[PDB]
Amino acid sequence: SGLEDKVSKQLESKGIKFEYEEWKVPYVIPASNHTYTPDFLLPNGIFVETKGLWESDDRKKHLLIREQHPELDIRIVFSSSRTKLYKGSPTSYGEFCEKHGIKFADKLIPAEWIKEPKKEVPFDRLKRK
């Protein structure tokens, strides 16, 4: 960058030796705690997240919850599941869900989901509003 060049030129002009980008320093970013509030909870225990724009951190969040709370049934209703992950991506929101086992639909909750037999929700692992 202009600054790196100026600093390098200065050190050389004064005859100071130096190593440039020669050493890496390892570090760990600590794990962090968060909470996610799905939009709707149906009587049969299915949670439904309505979603327009679906950002990367949001997608990672769903994968984390699936690994951390396998018993939760969290599905997504998209304004459009055909939307691509980003400006030039080949993958759609829907394809991402298919790849990771996330049940999804577009615009409205499918009649079939509402009809699914009730199942237990581990509310003990959850926090009420």
Q: Near its own copies by CB under 8 A, which window of 41-49, 84-92, 96-104?
A: 41-49
Instruction: Tell me whether strands 40-41 and 47-51 are parallel, antiparallel or unpaired.
Output: antiparallel
Note whether 77 and 109 are within 8 A (CB): yes
Q: Residue 41, SS3?
A: strand
**Residue 126 in contact with its own copies, rule: CB under 8 A:** yes
Residue from the set 12, 39, 55, 58 that interacts with Mn ion by CB under 5 A: 39
Q: How far is the CB of 20 from Mn ion (least distance, A)?
A: 9
Residues 49-88 that bind Mn ion (CB under 5 A): 49-50
**Residue 44 in contact with Mn ion, rule: CB under 5 A:** no
Residue from the set 101, 108, 112, 124 that interacts with its own copies by CB under 8 A: 108
Query: What phi and psi values does residue 125 have, to the nearest 5 degrees?
Result: -90, -5
Q: For residue 47, give the nearest of 72, 27, 23 by alpha carbon.
A: 72
**Residue 45 in contact with its own copies, rule: CB under 8 A:** no
Q: How far is CA 117 from CA 42, 47, 67, 77, 99, in A?
A: 11, 14, 23, 19, 25
Size of the site for its own copies (CB under 8 A): 64
Q: For residue 94, give the nearest of 114, 69, 115, 75 by alpha carbon.
A: 75
Q: Near its own copies by CB under 8 A, which window of 49-57, 81-89, 96-104?
A: 49-57
Residue from the set 12, 39, 55, 58 that interacts with its own copies by CB under 8 A: 39
Which residues are at the interface with Mn ion (CB under 5 A)?
39, 49-50
